[PDB]
Amino acid sequence: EIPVLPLRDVVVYPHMVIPLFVGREKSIRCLEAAMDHDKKIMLVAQKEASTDEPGVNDLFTVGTVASILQMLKLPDGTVKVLVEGLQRARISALSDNGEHFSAKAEYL
Amino acid sequence: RIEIPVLPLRDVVVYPHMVIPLFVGREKSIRCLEAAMDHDKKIMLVAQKEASTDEPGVNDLFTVGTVASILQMLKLPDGTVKVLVEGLQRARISALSDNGEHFSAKAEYL
Amino acid sequence: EIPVLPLRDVVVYPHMVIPLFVGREKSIRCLEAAMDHDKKIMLVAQKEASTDEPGVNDLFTVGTVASILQMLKLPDGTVKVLVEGLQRARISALSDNGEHFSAKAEYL
Amino acid sequence: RIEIPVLPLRDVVVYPHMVIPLFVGREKSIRCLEAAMDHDKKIMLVAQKEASTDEPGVNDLFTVGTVASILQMLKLPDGTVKVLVEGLQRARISALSDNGEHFSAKAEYL
Amino acid sequence: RIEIPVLPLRDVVVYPHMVIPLFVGREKSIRCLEAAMDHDKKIMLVAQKEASTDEPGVNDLFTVGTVASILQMLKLPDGTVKVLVEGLQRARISALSDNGEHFSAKAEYL
Amino acid sequence: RIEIPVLPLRDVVVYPHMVIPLFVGREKSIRCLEAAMDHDKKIMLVAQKEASTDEPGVNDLFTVGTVASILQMLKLPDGTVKVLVEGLQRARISALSDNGEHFSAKAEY
Amino acid sequence: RIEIPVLPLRDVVVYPHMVIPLFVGREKSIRCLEAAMDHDKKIMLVAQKEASTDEPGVNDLFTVGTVASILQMLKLPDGTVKVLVEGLQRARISALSDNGEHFSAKAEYL
Amino acid sequence: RIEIPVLPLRDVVVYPHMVIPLFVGREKSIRCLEAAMDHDKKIMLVAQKEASTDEPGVNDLFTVGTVASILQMLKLPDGTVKVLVEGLQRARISALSDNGEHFSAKAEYL
């Protein structure tokens, strides 16, 4: 139902518009998944922000569904993505298929 | 040409004049902030490259970042720390190191 | 119940941190009034308009209570105030008590 | 050197690289946004002086600003506008004019 | 960035410009050398974090090393391989894996 | 008649006249080094075969080696050692043993 | 920035981290070594430019080389010398001189 | 005995099994290398004594050296060569001859 992007450094809330930097392949995979759909992605913070390769157990289950407004792939392959927080949601079934995180969300 | 603590960032690029709340929840990064709080409250913000380790090492950061000042540092009940920063100016780091406590580097203001 | 700072150019929401620049003496009085109390002010958007300045009927009804993290008078006298949104509130009654706007708010 | 529509900002200051959703509620400013839209989506953000009103005159504006790109613009039914801008670069204004429809400036990038 | 076989080293450290004869007697490390000889004859030499084991796992290896060219490789009758290598340049590892056959890295020259 | 402490090596073969810094992180191997230091500074460098256990036994070592002198030994902060050696002479090992502390070899000079 | 004796090397190039046994049969070079020993054992190793004799003059020496430590030194029965050195780090030399007794220079660690 | 080209060395003593990069700039010494390459790639490495003449006579060369194999010859931008050699076996030279192109010697293995 929706790709999930883990965020460690910032906490994005509804109405915030923020340019994010995404240099990890999996997370890039995650953005592309959202683009291939309706540009919506689920932003969640990490319980333990201590690892940059979180597992499903390291993600919070409430976050902010956001829309991807602009995305551009830089020379080195890293991505700059502009997102806008739309509204809060709860995650219900965090899955990890290898490609990127995904889940079923319920708008709050 | 200055010696300054280094906070690695994964999700955002902070430019001069930006004022933003960052959340830090890693020992060495938290010690980085406190190191700066002790001195002139300034810290070097630099993006990290993808690495295979839980936390990036001295060889996993870009070379140009933004020197920022810590406007507010506030520990949170969940164990993390919200740190409000203001970007002052870009700088390039030349000799990054990890002395156990936190990363540190030599920076040249650009 | 709370001093009201009208904003023409941005709609500040809970969790947003942003520097505001205040050059109207009335607005400056508004800030001082909050610093005498608990440092909170209510940020309220100005409605479409043509007059030189807003009056008690020219603001929106829902705003954002925020705390003043810091202030600083600039050489020209304009005040630079760093604010942080906390939560939304509905304006019950908005008055212009001669010195600055004030309102009875209701947290949402 | 360029000629560009000028949008006065009272509450905030925008610099290069900052992305910010702005709110506009005055018709003259709406026209200025449209003038940019009818060209290259570039608009010049200029701060207002001390205690100028919401109907500033040319002498009430600063002589420097941030040229920005309009990333998104939505006109609400209520006659108000929401415009998402990204600051690109600063510029110096050599001449600021009010040509009846909105402010305009001959400016040079800094 | 390159993808390259990773050979762990326990007894010695190899830096750029060093030319040295290495003896390789473990099957996995031998496959590492054979894989390099099928690619472009380059291998990345990395120190081990745990010097007490001869069967390091991906977490037992450093994530920075010396990319070296194999100048000569000879398979001896005692089951070992003598490989002459020349250190070329340091590199960082962005991703380290063990496909069962040998260690492989996605690496970036420094 | 003389037992020489044995240092098992995995990555290089040291020949006479070669000088090289070796990094030794195994406790038993450091004991071998310590024993040489209490006597002669002489050690027998011997190649190890890929053992089934991670702790090699006498049967996991070649029976030829290089008698070498320890020129310098530096104890590192992590407890590991960097020892600079000079190969002196190759020799067949007539007997190889593990006196419960470190390996030892009788050399056929 | 230090003053250090300069030993020219024709046949090899010593880089940081290399440990190498050197043969020093020329009188002047022996004095060079002896002088480094009378101080802190440090010595500047420099390469020779093409078409230079075995009696180089100051214009025959490169100006960037390797500062090294003299680990061991032995004068043989024939007056010849065996010296063991370890390269520590590159340095650029300025003010290269020759008082007749041995080359010397002021150097700055790179 | 065997006939083999001779390369005098001043700074290092190469022994069997050693592999090392030698830098050779003297035209005559390069011809020495090229002659070896046009045969079996073996050259006799011999140390030289400080002599009054920079073109050593038989009495300016030690009599025992090491026959080495040329593993690689790389031209350098300054007109000189960097040659990778592997010592093979000690040999005694009994005659030195300057065939006008490069030194040559009759040598006895061991």
Task: Give the angle subtended at the CA of F76 by the CAs of F71 and F79, to the nearest 5°.
Answer: 115
On whether the CB atoms of residues C40 and C86 are closer than 8 A, the answer is yes
**Given in angstroms, what resolution was this structure solved at?**
2.0
Residues in chain E with CB shorter than 8 Å from the CB of H72 are 71
On whether the CB atoms of residues H27 and H38 are closer than 8 A, the answer is no
Instruction: Please report, for residues G50, H28, H94, the alpha-carbon distance to residue H32 in angstroms, rounded to integers and kept in the order given.
Output: 17, 6, 18
3-state secondary structure of H7: strand
**Cβ of E96 and B51 within 8 Å?**
no
Nearest-CA distance B105 → chain C (Å): 29
Residues in chain A with CB shorter than 8 Å from the CB of D19 are 17-19, 82
Distance separating alpha carbons of residues C13 and D30, to the nearest angstrom? 23
Residue at D30: amino acid letter: I
**Cβ of C13 and A11 within 8 Å?**
no
Distance separating alpha carbons of residues F6 and F35, to the nearest angstrom? 10
Distance separating alpha carbons of residues F45 and E20, to the nearest angstrom? 17
Beta bridge partners of B86: B19, B69
Distance separating alpha carbons of residues A2 and H93, to the nearest angstrom? 81
Q: What is the DSSP letter of H66?
A: E
Beta bridge partners of H104: H5, H97
Closest residue of chain C to D76, computed from CA coordinates:
C48
Instruction: Please report, for residues B88, C66, D12, the alpha-carbon distance to residue C20 in angstroms, rounded to integers and kept in the order given.
Output: 18, 12, 5
Distance separating alpha carbons of residues G38 and G29, to the nearest angstrom? 14
Q: Could you give the number of structural domains in chain H? A: 1
Do you know the residue count of chain D?
110
Closest residue of chain G to H23, computed from CA coordinates:
G11
**Buried b vs exposed e over D50-81: b needs ≥16 C-beta within 10 Å?**
ebbebebeeebbbeebbbbebbbbeeeeeebb
Mutate to test the interface with E, among G14, G15, G66 (most CBs of E within 10 A): G15
On whether the CB atoms of residues F90 and F66 are closer than 8 A, the answer is yes
| Beta strands E2-9 and E103-109, pairing class | antiparallel
Nearest residue to D13 via CA among C75, H12, B18: B18
Distance separating alpha carbons of residues B94 and B64, to the nearest angstrom? 9
**Cβ of E11 and F10 within 8 Å?**
yes
**Buried b vs exposed e over A56-86: b needs ≥16 C-beta within 10 Å?**
eeebeeebbbbebbbbeeeeeebbebbbbbe
Instruction: List, in sequence order, the alpha helices (H) in chain H.
Output: 27-37
On whether the CB atoms of residues B97 and B3 are closer than 8 A, the answer is no
Q: Rg of the Cα trace of chain A?
A: 12
Do you know the residue count of chain F?
109
**Cβ of A52 and B51 within 8 Å?**
yes
Residue at A46: amino acid letter: Q
Q: What is the DSSP letter of G59?
A: G
Which positions ≥6 away from D61 have C-beta within 8 Å?
A: D6, D8, D46, D47, D48, D49, D52, D96, D103
Distance of CA E1 to the CA centre of its chain: 17
On whether the CB atoms of residues E19 and G18 are closer than 8 A, the answer is no
Instruction: Give the method of determination.
Output: X-ray
On whether the CB atoms of residues C16 and C85 are closer than 8 A, the answer is yes
Domain limits for position C10 = 1-108
Residue at G18: amino acid letter: M
Residue at H36: amino acid letter: A
Is A69 part of the contact surface with chain D (CB cutoff 8 Å)?
Answer: yes
Is G17 part of the contact surface with chain E (CB cutoff 8 Å)?
Answer: yes
Residues in chain C with CB shorter than 8 Å from the CB of A11 are 15
Task: Give the angle subtended at the CA of B74 by the CAs of B71 and B77, to the nearest 5°.
Answer: 165
Residues in chain E with CB shorter than 8 Å from the CB of F47 are 23, 25, 80
| Beta strands H42-47 and H2-9, pairing class | parallel
Beta bridge partners of G5: G104
Q: Which chains touch H (3 or more CB pairs under 8 A)?
A: E, F, G
Q: CB neighbours (10 Å) of residue F2?
A: 11
Which positions ≥6 away from G78 have C-beta within 8 Å?
A: none
On whether the CB atoms of residues G7 and G33 are closer than 8 A, the answer is yes
Tokens of F41: 């500074």
Distance separating alpha carbons of residues A76 and H79, to the nearest angstrom? 38
Distance of CA F18 to the CA centre of its chain: 15
Which positions ≥6 away from E32 have C-beta within 8 Å?
A: E5, E6, E7, E43, E102, E103
Instruction: Please report, for residues A50, B10, G35, G60, the alpha-carbon distance to residue G76 in angstroms, rounded to integers and kept in the order given.
Output: 60, 60, 18, 29
Q: HSE-up of F90 (CA within 13 Å, CB side)?
A: 11
On whether the CB atoms of residues B14 and B87 are closer than 8 A, the answer is yes
In CATH, what number is assigned to the domain containing residue G18?
2.30.130.40
Residues in chain F with CB shorter than 8 Å from the CB of E55 are 54
Q: What is the DSSP letter of F34?
A: H
**Buried b vs exposed e over G85-104: b needs ≥16 C-beta within 10 Å?**
bbbeeebebeebeeeeebbb
Distance of CA C73 to the CA centre of its chain: 17
Q: What are phi and psi of G37, to 5 degrees?
A: -70, -40
**Buried b vs exposed e over H43-79: b needs ≥16 C-beta within 10 Å?**
bbbbbbbbeeeeebeeebbbeebbbbebbebeeeeee
Strand ranges for A1-108 from DSSP E:
2-7, 17-22, 40-45, 62-73, 79-91, 95-96, 101-103, 105-107
Lookup result for tokens 């390769």 = A53
Q: CB neighbours (10 Å) of residue A107?
A: 9
Distance separating alpha carbons of residues D3 and D105, to the nearest angstrom? 5
Instruction: Please report, for residues B70, E12, E18, H31, the alpha-carbon distance to residue H75 in angstroms, rounded to integers and kept in the order given.
Output: 55, 29, 18, 13
Instruction: Please report, for residues A26, A101, A108, C97, H22, the alpha-carbon distance to residue B13 in angstroms, rounded to integers and kept in the order given.
Output: 19, 23, 30, 44, 48
**Buried b vs exposed e over F33-65: b needs ≥16 C-beta within 10 Å?**
bebbeeeebbbbbbbbbbbeeeebeeeebbeeb
